[PDB]
Amino acid sequence: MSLQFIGLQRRDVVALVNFLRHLTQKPDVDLEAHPKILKKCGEKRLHRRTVLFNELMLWLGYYRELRFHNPDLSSVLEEFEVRCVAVARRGYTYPFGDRGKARDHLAVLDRTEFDTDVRHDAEIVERALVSAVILAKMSVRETLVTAIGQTEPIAFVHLKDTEVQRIEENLEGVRRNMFCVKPLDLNLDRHANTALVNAVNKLVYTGRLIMNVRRSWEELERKCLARIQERCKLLVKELRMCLSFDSNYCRNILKHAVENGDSADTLLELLIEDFDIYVDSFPQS
Amino acid sequence: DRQPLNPANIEARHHGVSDVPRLGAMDADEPLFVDDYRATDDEWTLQKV
Amino acid sequence: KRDEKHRHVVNVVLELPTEISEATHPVLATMLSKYTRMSSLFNDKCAFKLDLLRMVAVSRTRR
């Protein structure tokens, strides 16, 4: 697709095109994480109108690519369900010191189900994980917290500190790049650990992964929409200084407010389609 | 036309730009062309009254 | 030789009098590329006429 700009040498155009082309192959996929690419857009070398237009075009293309590569959630949720059921079974088998609170925590583990919409996953996996951690701590009879209004924090059980920080690094890398999924060479199963503990460790890893992916995508999409809206409003503000046919045409194109991905795609396609009609309104060099 | 509309069949009217396909699409049944503004509840009840 | 199809749209599709032409009407000259790109639906003449009218209107707009 002919994603096109104004006031750029062809080398910068192919640089931007290649940057979008290889977005997922690099760490820290956030746009502000690459000040060189963002600055190549035209800052301080061109008039305000054209640099704003170029930034808006780049943001639209970046948002389109991100929405294109948004990954599949199904297999991870299925794995989480399977592991939750396994933890529940192992907990039902185990001879706890007192069966009372173990009973209701196992009931909570049994109650877990995923909704059709993706916005509710965080809280349900949070409660499932906290109940699983409470069960695991009970199994090795550690003094779980009981302060008023306090709750048990989510943490791995009986793993070495180095391995814990390695897993934290892996999850952080997942947060840096949603699309790449770095596998663990580290093995969470230990001969020195009870099967219940191993199952809880697997479940907590999967829940952390899900929460990280969801939160990262949500905030990235929010940022993209905010940037696009701000650029559109400022560019509309600038175009009102002139009153030619081409400038009025561009303003009417920018009339549509963008707060949804589909509206963003329509705006981008319309802006590309009628490029030759309004191009001369922008000065260059 | 026949079926519930759903958002795939709703199109936004581009005002003040060339829209020849829409002008030809006049008298067509299925695709519904709308402005992107959506009425709020208060003005909905005012229209009703 | 784009001139032949531009003349086609201007004369048979837009049916403009000869006093109006690609040379003397800047917005018409601008819209000619868009109109020539969509070779289909030249049968629906009123659509092209109405689009030209609203293009003139937006050209004159002061808001």
DSSP-assigned states of every residue in chain B? --S---GGGEEE--TTS--HHHHHTTT-SSPEEE-S----HHHHHHHH-
What are the phi and psi torsion angles at A29 (to 5°)?
-65, 0
Question: Which of A107, A186, A96, A89 is closest to A138 using CA atoms?
Answer: A96
Residue of B nearest to C56 (CA): B16
Contact A245 C58 (CB under 8 A): yes
Indicate if the alpha-carbon torsion angle A196, A202, A208, A214 is positive or negative: negative
Out of A243, A248, A277, closest to residue C30 by CB:
A277
Across the interface, whether the CB atoms of C34 and A245 are under 8 A apart is answered no
Which residue, A50, A48, A38, A49, is CA-closest to A8?
A50
Give the residue from A274, A218, A283, A217 showing the smallest Cα distance to A249.
A274
For residues A163 and A238, the answer to whether their CB atoms sit within 8 Å is no
Please give the helix or strand (H or E) that residue C56 lies within, else none: helix C45-60
Residues in chain B: 49
Q: Which residues of B touch A257 (CB under 8 A)?
A: 36
Nearest to A277 by CA among A258, A242, A252: A252
* Residue A57 backbone dihedrals phi, psi, to 5 degrees: -60, -45
Contact flag B16-C54 (C-beta cutoff 8 Å): yes
Which of A60, A11, A120, A39 lies closest to A254, judged by CA? A60
Distance of CA C35 to the CA centre of its chain: 7
Q: Rounded to whole angstroms, how far apart are CA atoms A219 and A137?
A: 33
Q: How many CA atoms lie less than 13 Å away from A91 in the CB half-sphere?
A: 30
DSSP conformational letter for C40: T
CA–CA min distance B23, chain A (Å): 17
- Within 10 Å of residue B32's Cβ, how many Cβ atoms? 11
Q: Do residue C27 and residue A276 have CB atoms under 8 angstroms apart?
A: no
Do the Cβ atoms of A255 and B12 come within 8 Å? no
The token pair that represents A45 in the structure block: 């070398």
Distance, C-alpha A130 to centroid of its chain: 23
Residues of C with CB under 8 A from a CB of B: 31, 34-35, 38, 41, 44, 46-48, 50-51, 54-55, 58, 61
In terms of DSSP H, where are the helices of chain A?
A: 10-21, 35-39, 48-69, 74-93, 99-111, 121-139, 161-176, 195-239, 245-253, 261-273, 275-278
Q: What angle do CA A40, A42, A46 make, to 5 degrees?
A: 155
- A262-283: string of b/e by CB count within 10 Å (b at 16+)? ebbebbbebbeebeebbeebbe
Nearest-CA neighbor of A204 among A94, A92, A109, A115?
A: A109
- Neighbouring CB atoms inside 10 A of C37's CB total 10
- Find out whether A57 and A12 touch, Cβ atoms under 8 Å: no
Burial annotation A170-206 (CB, 10 A radius, 16+ → b, else e)? bbeebebbbeeeeeeeeebeeeebbebbbbbbbbbbb
List of chain B residues whose C-beta atoms are within 8 Å of the C-beta of residue C51: 18-20, 23
Token pair, residue A281, equals: 């309104």
For A231, the token pair is 């650029």
The experimental technique used to determine this model is cryo-EM
Interface test with C, best of B17, B20, B26 (most C CBs within 10 A): B20
- The C-alpha of A249 sits at a distance from chain C's nearest C-alpha, in angstroms, of 7
Q: What is the resolution of this structure in A?
A: 3.0
Please give the C-alpha separations between residue B34 and each of A5, B14, B38, in angstroms, as whole numbers: 30, 9, 9
CA distance A32 to A67: 18
Query: In this structure, what token pair is assigned to residue A123?
Result: 């809280």
Task: Determine, for residues A274 and C59 on separate chains, whether the beta-carbon distance falls below 8 Å.
Answer: no
Chain C nearest C-alpha distance from A121 (Å)? 48
